[PDB]
Design a binder for this molecule. Structure first.
Ligand SMILES: Cc1nc2c(c(=O)[nH]1)CSCC2
Ligand SMILES: [Zn+2]
Length: 198
């Protein structure tokens, strides 16, 4: 039932992307192959210690959410954790770690920014053959700064613990959530899947 809940979140949050599938491929659903619960006690303690600290700074509320993260470095993340030292100021909300509430938005980043050159075997961003991996993460948002337009920051805004990118006509199509401290996310589930041909 635990993994069925994860499959449901993965499938139901798929959306039609404005780039016509350029970055992540053309699909309406996935073929979910594996769902593995990541058990990293040192990373979990780092996460819960920070979560308690954020809660005390946000009226006894962590404002935790389960969010997706796509990256070519998922295997490094499950072992070493999220690391803001690998984040650079170039992004929409600057040098943060980015998460999506729509799995298909995170799928656009599995092979790199804008989908890179796609899978290493066929160099195809819309590869239906190669197995992809996504993370479904615990993310502590705390006091989240609501923002619509690009704001390149190095750290959370003063008094805040994260940034929420909200959709707008000139801006974002879908929401995104940005943390500036790696310990504010835990890679709880490793999802192995394929995008499926419509
Ligand atoms: C690397 C990466 N970036 C983003 C996302 C992601 O999953 N990975 C989703 S929100 C937009 C940016
Ligand atoms: Zn491939």
């Amino acid at each position: 039932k635990e993994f069925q809940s994860v499959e449901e979140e993965m499938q139901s949050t798929v959306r039609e992307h404005r780039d016509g599938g350029h970055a992540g491929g053309i699909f309406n659903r996935y073929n979910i192959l594996k769902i593995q619960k990541v058990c990293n006690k040192k990373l979990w303690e780092r996460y819960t210690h920070r979560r308690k600290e954020v809660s005390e700074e946000n009226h006894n509320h962590a404002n935790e959410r389960m969010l997706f993260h796509g990256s070519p470095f998922v295997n490094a993340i499950i072992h070493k954790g999220f690391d803001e030292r690998h984040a650079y100021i170039g992004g929409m909300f600057g040098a943060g770690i980015y998460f999506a509430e729509n799995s298909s938005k995170s799928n656009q980043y599995v092979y790199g920014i804008g989908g890179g050159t796609g899978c290493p075997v066929h160099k195809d961003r819309s590869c239906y053959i190669c197995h992809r991996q996504l993370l479904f993460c615990r993310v502590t948002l705390g006091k989240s700064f609501l923002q619509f337009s690009a704001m390149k920051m190095a750290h959370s805004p003063p008094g805040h613990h994260s940034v929420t990118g909200r959709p707008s006509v000139n801006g974002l199509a879908l929401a995104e959530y940005v943390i500036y401290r790696g310990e504010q996310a835990y890679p709880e589930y490793l999802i192995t899947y394929q995008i499926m041909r419509p």
